[PDB]
Write a protein that binds this ligand. Sequence first.
Ligand SMILES: CCCCCCCCO[C@@H]1O[C@H](CO)[C@@H](O)[C@H](O)[C@H]1O
Ligand SMILES: CCCCCCCCO[C@@H]1O[C@H](CO)[C@@H](O)[C@H](O)[C@H]1O
Ligand SMILES: CCCCCCCCO[C@@H]1O[C@H](CO)[C@@H](O)[C@H](O)[C@H]1O
Ligand SMILES: CCCCCCCCO[C@@H]1O[C@H](CO)[C@@H](O)[C@H](O)[C@H]1O
Ligand SMILES: CCCCCCCCO[C@@H]1O[C@H](CO)[C@@H](O)[C@H](O)[C@H]1O
Lengths: 257, 257, 266, 257, 256
Amino acid sequence: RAHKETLDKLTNAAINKINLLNTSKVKYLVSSAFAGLYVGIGILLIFTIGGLLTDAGSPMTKIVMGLSFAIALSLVIMTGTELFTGNNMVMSAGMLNKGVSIKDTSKIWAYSWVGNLIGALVLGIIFVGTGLVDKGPVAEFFANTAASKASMPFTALFFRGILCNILVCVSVLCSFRTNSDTAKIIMIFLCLFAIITSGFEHSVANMTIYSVSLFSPTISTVTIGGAIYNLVAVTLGNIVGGALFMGLGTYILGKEK
Amino acid sequence: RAHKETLDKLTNAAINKINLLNTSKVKYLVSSAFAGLYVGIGILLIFTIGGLLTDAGSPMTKIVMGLSFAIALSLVIMTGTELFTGNNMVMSAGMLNKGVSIKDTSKIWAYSWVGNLIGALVLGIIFVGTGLVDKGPVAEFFANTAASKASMPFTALFFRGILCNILVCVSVLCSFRTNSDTAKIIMIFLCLFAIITSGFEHSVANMTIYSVSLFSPTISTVTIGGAIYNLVAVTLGNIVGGALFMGLGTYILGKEK
Amino acid sequence: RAHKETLDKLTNAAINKINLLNTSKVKYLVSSAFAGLYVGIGILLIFTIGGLLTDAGSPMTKIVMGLSFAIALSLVIMTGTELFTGNNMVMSAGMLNKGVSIKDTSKIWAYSWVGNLIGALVLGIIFVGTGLVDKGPVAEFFANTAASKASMPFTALFFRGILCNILVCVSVLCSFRTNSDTAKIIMIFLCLFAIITSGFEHSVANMTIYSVSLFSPTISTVTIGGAIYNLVAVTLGNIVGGALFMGLGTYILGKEKLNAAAENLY
Amino acid sequence: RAHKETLDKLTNAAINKINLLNTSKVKYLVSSAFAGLYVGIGILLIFTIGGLLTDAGSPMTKIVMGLSFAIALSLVIMTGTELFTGNNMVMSAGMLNKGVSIKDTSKIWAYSWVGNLIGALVLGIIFVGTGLVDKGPVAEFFANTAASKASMPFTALFFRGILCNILVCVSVLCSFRTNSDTAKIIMIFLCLFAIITSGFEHSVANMTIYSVSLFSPTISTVTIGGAIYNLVAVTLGNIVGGALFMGLGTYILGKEK
Amino acid sequence: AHKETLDKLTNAAINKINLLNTSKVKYLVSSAFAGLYVGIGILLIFTIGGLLTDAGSPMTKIVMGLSFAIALSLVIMTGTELFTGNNMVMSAGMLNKGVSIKDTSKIWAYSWVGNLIGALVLGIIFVGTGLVDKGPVAEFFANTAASKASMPFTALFFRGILCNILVCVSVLCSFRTNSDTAKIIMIFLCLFAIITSGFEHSVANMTIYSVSLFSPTISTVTIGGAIYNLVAVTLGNIVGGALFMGLGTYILGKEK
Ligand SMILES: CCCCCCCCO[C@@H]1O[C@H](CO)[C@@H](O)[C@H](O)[C@H]1O
Ligand SMILES: CCCCCCCCO[C@@H]1O[C@H](CO)[C@@H](O)[C@H](O)[C@H]1O
Ligand SMILES: CCCCCCCCO[C@@H]1O[C@H](CO)[C@@H](O)[C@H](O)[C@H]1O
Ligand SMILES: CCCCCCCCO[C@@H]1O[C@H](CO)[C@@H](O)[C@H](O)[C@H]1O
Ligand SMILES: CCCCCCCCO[C@@H]1O[C@H](CO)[C@@H](O)[C@H](O)[C@H]1O
């Protein structure tokens, strides 16, 4: 094990995040926007896959979607950009280890969440302009998925959000624990396969699901109300998974007591 | 050849394990709980696959499930967390090599088994909360699988547990014999593929099978009694495979006489 | 982090490109020609797959095509040759960081683009010469695809071009951010999967699509006006994606803000 | 090209093998037993696959089997254990190069062959004990394969053994020519894919095929005379493939003359 | 790093001719291994071809391409002498004045013949397994051999060109990376392209014809057919490897 080294790295990354934000809100928001859009790119890919295999009646739909989502977090980690969901574990661990404050943590979470959203809104806009969701099985996949995610009960979304961010954050944790970029990508691939195929909920990914569905004139039954309901429920779950499980857990393992 | 050095690393790992437990029961149990939960995440993924493909009558079902289970031990190894089944070989070799004692071994086995179960209990509760096993093929897949595992003859479960833990512990052994994290993950992928598709029995994975099946009000094919029956038989078989084959074996290979 | 170091690498890459171009038109155009042909090789592969699976009715067609396209940018990055689409991000970042001039940039872009085109033309001539697109599902896939791309609205092609080059350029960016050649190839595989299966537009790849179709004797029904319209719309799209998004974006991330010799972020 | 360096490595390895055997028969036999069982694990997996896909009438059966066999030699190489077929090239090259005697070679061949057999016997007994070949397509797949392998003309088996051990030994040769463990596993994956899907014959894998077939009450398609016939023919072919092609070939490339 | 790459190709060309000059046996043995290693890839993918063609699968050519990587991977990882790869290496080394034209034709002649010996040996042994006595694999060899030998010259020539661009560029990648895993991946991608696209490889065809001509399965092949295919494809391979990759890498790297 190298639990203490790992906690040191998490704490140093938390310190580095808040110093970045304090040094430049533009730099922090651009990074956050990049991460939001990168995650959204994975969504565009796997929903195209979703539409294609759904229209085909394939039993393998959710499995192929899961296998194909690795790009989302892979791009985030390989570009060193700012992802809200990953920040749940990093800021909480660093905060518990007294490297950052609670205010620092809430500031980082707020900014990366908004930045992530800006990225998703841009992607959504651009994607709608390609005409790829003007009509057909791919537009319908966005339309139906958006609707079902927005009509789920609060408790279900919350618990799905917890399990999702346990997986997002453990993949981030693995990247702090190896020097091999290939190993990092493989672990990301495995974790995101688990997330998508199992049906867990990811606030940042949902941002693109809703920006596309909402910006698309291919009607679809969503509404901003439903989008907000889902994002709030899922964000709360994500925070619990990342901070209360992963952040607290890694702190307990690594705390120089 | 390099068996001596491998035995040396195994011995040191066994020494570090008992020192951790002597230092902090909380740290040790948290690490164990993480590992039990990580293994369970693999179960949630492949049982989702099992439900999807069984429902479709696919002949590829058990093959796809085996290929998709790699995350379970990959997460454990890459996070440095405490897994009971792997401890069967490590403590065993370490004890034989006079680095730790018999009571040290029994203590580590008991705590890691219980801590792993804690992780499975937590994951099961949260998974039930997702609503993902309310009804439909995934719930059916948990219910039917838990039922069949609980009604297998003792001897069958025992021998399945032996072969399972030979594979788990050899994947752990490979991790002690390479410096490449990518190669570690590949070997784990191969061994877990063999375990799942061949039909071998893993006590720690079964903890999540039974936590989900028993916590879900939607599932009513098994009882705590059936869970205990399967867990006891499979755990005994696991111990024989990890300690009697892999532990004794690596000691013999490595013991500088 | 580590964005500053990444910015320094992009800027050095930019300076090296204009330098080599200044030194030898021949060296630069051959490098660009290789890159154009390498990308086209990917097209020849996935369009053969397109033809095969389309004629078979498969629903996995576009997924298998996406999974099989990695060779295109993998070859470019592993041979270190000049690809127009990638040059958008590198030249703009370097220029913004005041390592290369606006003049240097539109030059590299011009030479790389044309050089990429030469490669596609030569590949197209040779491929048709194999007789593999004399008749049948593959020849048609080339034909029908060429027609559909040349008959889409500007807006659509533009935005498809933006998204395409975001992905092309981010894979180039990953290659600057790791020392693992395997991780580089894996990131390329993922990005190109996303590009092809999602349906984004790549100018350099389109160069080979139209060269084959305009060289193939199985008639056409696309025409040269269509091709150039496409390459124009997609190229502008590509430029915005790579220069406006990736170039400016990486500049902002990496530019050490003391300096400040000129502009202040907030 | 590094042909001399490669022969120098093969020669050191031959020396180290005979020294080990001379030092401890128990260590040498235990190591050989492990390698036999590890290869056998590959057989249990791919024959499970065989039964599943053959029962389903799948055309991809032999392809998936080949893709799934990599674990057999991957485990042997990553654990550093003694495999008879690999020793055909190593001992012969080291013998030609005067690092070891002809008698050392005979000794190593006989001991590893028998030790491999012990591992296969042990694996077979335990596998039968699982109830996994009690009845159904997997048992039938063992029964049918064991029978066809036993009824082939000597000539056919012999030449199949030559090509098999060209592939086993070249994968071993690859492992001497790289420092990348991931590259070693990939080359093993490719070679074993070629062996299984093409239909070549591996003596050590066949030990497990026949141990299961002869230990399972539900398998009556073959006799001990039949196993012995196949094993002799295939062993002879393996020896020619490994020693006369790979051993002599690598000696010729590397010998400073 | 074009200059360093050209230096590497030049040093590889020099070491090849030096080797041949020192020992024809060592050089021919190495060439025979490379021919057999490439042939092993053919045995595997033609087994796949027979299996899937018999089943009417639209994935046949795709699965074959994905499964051919072993052919050049064995060559590169064993350090053996492959004719097609020597088209780029010797030409680059020659233009860079490390070796002569005479050296090049010599290395080409010896590796081609050595590759062929490896293919003949493999074909004989494979026929001896009984695996092509009858059935869809035997049929796949016979039909493929016949189709390749009945193609027009021009078609074979151009397919040979694209094939060796891919073979040689995979070799080029191996000179431009220190990662053995990256080398294998690049080889996997290039061979996937070669096989699935339908390009022509002289050395691989050596095994196709040695198997088909040694096997009991009746084909319309004939030795005259094989030789015709091999000549046309070899010239195409030479053009692709020497004129494109050889000349190209020299131009990229030459410090002038
Ligand atoms: C272009 C869009 C910019 C969005 C900026 C959002 C910043 C919100 O502001 C932050 O929110 C937290 C809780 O609400 C507080 O605890 C922080 O102190 C506060 O800075
Ligand atoms: C909240 C979780 C508490 C876990 C406590 C586990 C303690 C088990 O206790 C152990 O049991 C063994 C026998 O099975 C003994 O041999 C060990 O000596 C003993 O320490
Ligand atoms: C040891 C393996 C996992 C043990 C999980 C124990 C959880 C049992 O708990 C209860 O059992 C009831 C009836 O069977 C269920 O109906 C209830 O949902 C559940 O509360
Ligand atoms: C699932 C199969 C994916 C294979 C990816 C392997 C990538 C490993 O990583 C690569 O290979 C070597 C690792 O041992 C290193 O030497 C290289 O530097 C590195 O590029
Ligand atoms: C469990 C016991 C198995 C032991 C295997 C015994 C095989 C030894 O037997 C012999 O050894 C000689 C050299 O010492 C060789 O010359 C002979 O070839 C070999 O048959």
